[PDB]
Design a protein around this ligand. Structure first.
Ligand code: ADN
Ligand code: ADN
Ligand code: BTN
Ligand code: BTN
Lengths: 234, 235
């Protein structure tokens, strides 16, 4: 009854009033490619590192993918989610910018996060977007940005449509997404990579593998992988 | 993202752009009680007694997984939950739906919806097909045809699920209540023909405490019809 006209993403949609995590369900359940798992609320939502607040009002969903692309391209699925969110936000007159590698900010406030996990040769693309829900201190939502409630289903429709388009092109031209990320991410600013061997520098660009290129004050250039990176804006 | 607030029916909803049959998927798959299977269109829609049910885009084609822990004597009334739920939703949209015993809903004697219940003991599948904005077979009708304009399909879905959830929860508590709702919304007082092992005609007087259709033949003989392997035809 939803009348979705997408090719792959959204062929099937499993909706939950409540769920532990859409990502966990998508990983542990046999689902055909393109199946979307979405819930009004998550009781155990999570993302990069070890919680992702998922109260009623937001868009919490996961997409099952099994892309038949070269091994080295598989890691770029996270960018499809980030760019899809940016495109949807623009449709609603909101300017979102990507905080490499998986977050979307509006005026430097977090409005969405992407988490990609796997199970077998299935890839699960998880996306959390604050719409009308309460958000953690320092974060924002479409409602807070627009000053009014936003029809949640309309956001879902927009995002699924954008993701389907990005995914279909990714299957044929897997390098294209990097250009979209580059033109929509925060660059030219100082950042600090946390953890062992922590360092600071200017976030210059992302390379052909989606690695963040940082120029340290000494002139040294380091390439950061986005598997489970911890980054801070200075 | 649908924000359903129902207790059981609609806890989960599995939507399909296309499916063979929501009833078949529901019967076959491992699903929890209250899960709703809905599709934009069905390629193999089924009606009662092996009939074909046209399910083009524009209509509401869904099935609900139920596991009612009521006495076996009450299980046959589940089809009525579907019929009444549809009637209530139609009234919400100001359409006068009336029940054609025991599983059809008509508007001015034209079929607008059909209900098919399939069970095996514990797991019961309640299937409902309602014509909304889709083209229909000659002689049938739809919400769009009745109102003269397109009706938001999702609005009909929300309405029906809400009604079905309420009806089902009360059914578990008071299994007899549904019978009163069927009586008040069914076509009675007219001549009908009952088709099964042969056939007979008479006035459809009412439904009894078992949901059986009470028919008064011209001779004065009274027959009680149990649904399952029979069809009803208005004269
Ligand atoms: N619903 C949410 N919206 C935005 N950020 C969240 C949410 N839940 C947890 N966070 C975390 O708060 C951080 C914002 O500083 C993000 O990196 C994000 O992972
Ligand atoms: N979508 C539909 N709406 C109303 N009646 C239908 C529909 N599909 C099939 N039928 C009915 O099922 C019967 C054939 O088994 C016919 O009387 C036909 O009109
Ligand atoms: O910002 C991040 O670190 C990633 C957050 C990802 C959140 C979404 S909500 C839908 C899906 N289910 C989860 O448990 N996590 C992701
Ligand atoms: O009038 C009838 O004989 C019953 C028709 C039941 C139609 C619905 S459409 C949803 C569900 N899936 C099916 O294949 N049949 C039922």
């Amino acid at each position: 009854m939803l009348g979705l006209k997408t090719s792959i993403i959204g062929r099937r949609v499993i909706y939950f009033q409540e769920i532990t995590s859409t990502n966990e369900f998508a990983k542990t359940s046999y689902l055909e490619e393109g199946t979307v798992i979405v819930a009004d609320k998550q009781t155990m939502g999570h993302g990069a590192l070890n919680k992702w607040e998922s109260p009623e009002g937001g868009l919490w969903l996961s997409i099952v993918l099994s892309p038949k692309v070269p091994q080295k391209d598989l890691p770029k699925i996270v960018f499809l989610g980030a760019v899809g969110v940016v495109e949807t936000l623009k449709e609603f007159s909101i300017d979102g910018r990507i905080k490499w590698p998986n977050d979307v900010l509006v005026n430097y406030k977090a409005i969405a996060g992407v988490l990609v996990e796997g199970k077998g040769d299935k890839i699960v693309l998880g996306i959390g977007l604050n719409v009308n829900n309460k958000v953690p201190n320092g974060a924002t939502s479409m409602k807070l940005e627009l000053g009014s409630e936003v029809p949640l289903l309309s956001v879902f429709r927009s995002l699924i449509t954008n993701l389907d388009r990005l995914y279909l092109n990714f299957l044929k031209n897997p390098m294209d997404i990097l250009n979209l990320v580059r033109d929509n991410m925060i660059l030219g600013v100082r950042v600090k990579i946390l953890g062992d061997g922590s360092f600071e520098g200017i976030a210059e660009d992302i390379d052909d593998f989606g690695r963040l290129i940082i120029r340290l004050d000494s002139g040294e250039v380091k390439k950061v992988i986005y598997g489970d990176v911890s980054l801070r804006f200075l």
